[PDB]
Enzyme design. Sequence first.
Site, PDB file in Angstrom:
ATOM      1  N   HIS A  62       0.835  -1.250   0.000  1.00  0.00           N
ATOM      2  CA  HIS A  62       0.000   0.000   0.000  1.00  0.00           C
ATOM      3  C   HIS A  62       0.844   1.263   0.000  1.00  0.00           C
ATOM      4  O   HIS A  62       0.477   2.256  -0.622  1.00  0.00           O
ATOM      5  CB  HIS A  62      -0.972   0.025   1.207  1.00  0.00           C
ATOM      6  CG  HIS A  62      -1.792  -1.219   1.349  1.00  0.00           C
ATOM      7  ND1 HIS A  62      -2.736  -1.577   0.415  1.00  0.00           N
ATOM      8  CD2 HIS A  62      -1.832  -2.161   2.316  1.00  0.00           C
ATOM      9  CE1 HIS A  62      -3.338  -2.681   0.803  1.00  0.00           C
ATOM     10  NE2 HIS A  62      -2.805  -3.065   1.954  1.00  0.00           N
ATOM     11  N   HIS A  92       5.150   7.088   6.832  1.00  0.00           N
ATOM     12  CA  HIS A  92       4.921   6.667   5.459  1.00  0.00           C
ATOM     13  C   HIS A  92       4.385   7.871   4.705  1.00  0.00           C
ATOM     14  O   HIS A  92       4.088   8.909   5.273  1.00  0.00           O
ATOM     15  CB  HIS A  92       3.925   5.506   5.399  1.00  0.00           C
ATOM     16  CG  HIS A  92       2.585   5.894   5.955  1.00  0.00           C
ATOM     17  ND1 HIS A  92       2.297   5.837   7.277  1.00  0.00           N
ATOM     18  CD2 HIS A  92       1.492   6.442   5.352  1.00  0.00           C
ATOM     19  CE1 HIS A  92       1.103   6.370   7.484  1.00  0.00           C
ATOM     20  NE2 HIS A  92       0.588   6.756   6.323  1.00  0.00           N
ATOM     21  N   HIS A  94       1.742   9.154   1.173  1.00  0.00           N
ATOM     22  CA  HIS A  94       0.751   8.949   0.138  1.00  0.00           C
ATOM     23  C   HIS A  94       1.132   9.875  -1.024  1.00  0.00           C
ATOM     24  O   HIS A  94       1.526  11.005  -0.787  1.00  0.00           O
ATOM     25  CB  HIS A  94      -0.672   9.286   0.634  1.00  0.00           C
ATOM     26  CG  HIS A  94      -1.045   8.552   1.886  1.00  0.00           C
ATOM     27  ND1 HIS A  94      -1.818   7.429   1.894  1.00  0.00           N
ATOM     28  CD2 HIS A  94      -0.718   8.790   3.190  1.00  0.00           C
ATOM     29  CE1 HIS A  94      -1.950   7.010   3.147  1.00  0.00           C
ATOM     30  NE2 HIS A  94      -1.299   7.809   3.968  1.00  0.00           N
ATOM     31  N   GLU A 104      -3.732  13.493   0.826  1.00  0.00           N
ATOM     32  CA  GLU A 104      -5.027  13.018   1.400  1.00  0.00           C
ATOM     33  C   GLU A 104      -5.829  14.220   1.910  1.00  0.00           C
ATOM     34  O   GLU A 104      -6.923  14.506   1.415  1.00  0.00           O
ATOM     35  CB  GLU A 104      -4.742  11.956   2.482  1.00  0.00           C
ATOM     36  CG  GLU A 104      -4.103  10.718   1.905  1.00  0.00           C
ATOM     37  CD  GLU A 104      -4.358   9.489   2.694  1.00  0.00           C
ATOM     38  OE1 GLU A 104      -4.065   9.514   3.912  1.00  0.00           O
ATOM     39  OE2 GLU A 104      -4.835   8.488   2.109  1.00  0.00           O
ATOM     40  N   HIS A 117       2.969  11.125   6.686  1.00  0.00           N
ATOM     41  CA  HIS A 117       2.285  10.828   7.953  1.00  0.00           C
ATOM     42  C   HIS A 117       3.269  10.224   8.934  1.00  0.00           C
ATOM     43  O   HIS A 117       3.791   9.144   8.691  1.00  0.00           O
ATOM     44  CB  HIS A 117       1.117   9.840   7.725  1.00  0.00           C
ATOM     45  CG  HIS A 117      -0.007  10.470   6.994  1.00  0.00           C
ATOM     46  ND1 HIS A 117      -0.984   9.726   6.348  1.00  0.00           N
ATOM     47  CD2 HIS A 117      -0.296  11.781   6.800  1.00  0.00           C
ATOM     48  CE1 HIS A 117      -1.813  10.576   5.802  1.00  0.00           C
ATOM     49  NE2 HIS A 117      -1.438  11.816   6.052  1.00  0.00           N
ATOM     50  N   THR A 196      -6.589   6.662   7.714  1.00  0.00           N
ATOM     51  CA  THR A 196      -7.036   6.856   6.339  1.00  0.00           C
ATOM     52  C   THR A 196      -6.954   5.588   5.503  1.00  0.00           C
ATOM     53  O   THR A 196      -7.328   5.630   4.311  1.00  0.00           O
ATOM     54  CB  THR A 196      -6.263   7.979   5.634  1.00  0.00           C
ATOM     55  OG1 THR A 196      -4.951   7.504   5.389  1.00  0.00           O
ATOM     56  CG2 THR A 196      -6.283   9.276   6.390  1.00  0.00           C
ATOM     57  N   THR A 197      -6.507   4.483   6.102  1.00  0.00           N
ATOM     58  CA  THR A 197      -6.555   3.173   5.479  1.00  0.00           C
ATOM     59  C   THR A 197      -7.368   2.236   6.373  1.00  0.00           C
ATOM     60  O   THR A 197      -7.451   2.442   7.588  1.00  0.00           O
ATOM     61  CB  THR A 197      -5.163   2.543   5.309  1.00  0.00           C
ATOM     62  OG1 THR A 197      -4.507   2.446   6.585  1.00  0.00           O
ATOM     63  CG2 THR A 197      -4.290   3.379   4.423  1.00  0.00           C
TER      64      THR A 197
HETATM   65  N1  LIG Z   1      -2.597   6.737   6.818  1.00  0.00           N
HETATM   66  S1  LIG Z   1      -2.667   6.758   8.409  1.00  0.00           S
HETATM   67  O1  LIG Z   1      -1.517   7.529   8.954  1.00  0.00           O
HETATM   68  O2  LIG Z   1      -3.983   7.223   8.847  1.00  0.00           O
HETATM   69  C1  LIG Z   1      -2.566   5.103   9.070  1.00  0.00           C
HETATM   70  C2  LIG Z   1      -1.635   4.151   8.322  1.00  0.00           C
HETATM   71  C3  LIG Z   1      -1.730   2.648   8.719  1.00  0.00           C
HETATM   72  C4  LIG Z   1      -2.250   2.364  10.152  1.00  0.00           C
HETATM   73  C5  LIG Z   1      -1.627   1.153  10.905  1.00  0.00           C
HETATM   74  C6  LIG Z   1      -2.330  -0.186  11.222  1.00  0.00           C
HETATM   75  B1  LIG Z   1      -2.605  -1.232   9.998  1.00  0.00           B
HETATM   76  B2  LIG Z   1      -2.370  -2.851  10.700  1.00  0.00           B
HETATM   77  B3  LIG Z   1      -3.586  -2.985  12.011  1.00  0.00           B
HETATM   78  B4  LIG Z   1      -4.015  -2.162  10.509  1.00  0.00           B
HETATM   79  B5  LIG Z   1      -4.554  -1.514  12.077  1.00  0.00           B
HETATM   80  B6  LIG Z   1      -3.246  -1.755  13.292  1.00  0.00           B
HETATM   81  B7  LIG Z   1      -1.888  -2.565  12.435  1.00  0.00           B
HETATM   82  B8  LIG Z   1      -1.268  -1.509  11.172  1.00  0.00           B
HETATM   83  B9  LIG Z   1      -1.831  -0.857  12.795  1.00  0.00           B
HETATM   84  C7  LIG Z   1      -3.467  -0.291  12.495  1.00  0.00           C
HETATM   85  B10 LIG Z   1      -3.978  -0.390  10.819  1.00  0.00           B
HETATM   86 ZN   LIG Z   2      -1.141   7.729   5.994  1.00  0.00          ZN
END
Ligand SMILES: [N]S(=O)(=O)[C][C][C][C][C]C1234B567B89%10B%11%12%13B85%14B%1158B%12%11%15B%139%12B%1061B%12%112C5%153B%14874
Ligand SMILES: [Zn+2]
Length: 258
Positions: A62, A92, A94, A104, A117, A196-197
């Site tokens: 991603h 990271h 975008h 974004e 971000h 945002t993901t």
């Molecule tokens: N674009 S942003 O900065 O809003 C967030 C980027 C990714 C967020 C990190 C996760 B992924 B995997 B699980 B899923 B849930 B837990 B683990 B990684 B962290 C959060 B989500």
């Molecule tokens: Zn992000």
Amino acid sequence: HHWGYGKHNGPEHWHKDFPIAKGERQSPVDIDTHTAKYDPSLKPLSVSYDQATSLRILNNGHAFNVEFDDSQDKAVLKGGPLDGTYRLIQFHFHWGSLDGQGSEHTVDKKKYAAELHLVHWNTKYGDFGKAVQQPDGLAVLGIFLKVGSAKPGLQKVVDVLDSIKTKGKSADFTNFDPRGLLPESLDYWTYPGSLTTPPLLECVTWIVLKEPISVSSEQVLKFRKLNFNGEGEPEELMVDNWRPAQPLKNRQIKASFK
Ligand SMILES: [N]S(=O)(=O)[C][C][C][C][C]C1234B567B89%10B%11%12%13B85%14B%1158B%12%11%15B%139%12B%1061B%12%112C5%153B%14874
Ligand SMILES: [Zn+2]
Ligand code: NA
């Protein structure tokens, strides 16, 4: 058929697996600069990255994540709109297929070429996984990128990307100093929002800096050589990995500056 950024799995589809996509505090948003209210109660942001120990860089299919060792109070965000202290875990970006899109957040509907971000979790919840279950669990510092002069502090990131071209590739990435990615001014907008993901959890205090950083065309072109696909799969360039602006609903965006 997992989520991504394409016609058949992109942002307009996410709500089927993640119904919070249509929630009350989704991100990103358009920042209407004239409606954002100056809040004299907002504190300067405190960004303390002098002891940040970067460890590794990862292509997750991603984006790419630069990860940090978050096992001690080192790299922390505090002040600003925040109560308590938030520890840096990763950053990271975008970005777009073209310089005219990629961010974004938008500013009076302006899209920047990219958005950085820096993700931080609230130490009161002990770890990142617990923090994302809380409405004040994360603080994400967002920084816009425009194309112009090179950002010398970005070049170490650009130069490692050839080694993580495809999804699931990672590389050692130690001693990277994220202070080299910050603009001069820490003036910001802030509002309550979400990841945002997927999973789109409504756990983020957003802090979006007003001042963009400049990167060169060559730097952003190297982002666009990454692949969404894994090694030995049909090449799909990693571009346009941004979610569009979502409805503001019952939120106020606050400005730290007049
Ligand atoms: N674009 S942003 O900065 O809003 C967030 C980027 C990714 C967020 C990190 C996760 B992924 B995997 B699980 B899923 B849930 B837990 B683990 B990684 B962290 C959060 B989500
Ligand atoms: Zn992000
Ligand atoms: Na607007």
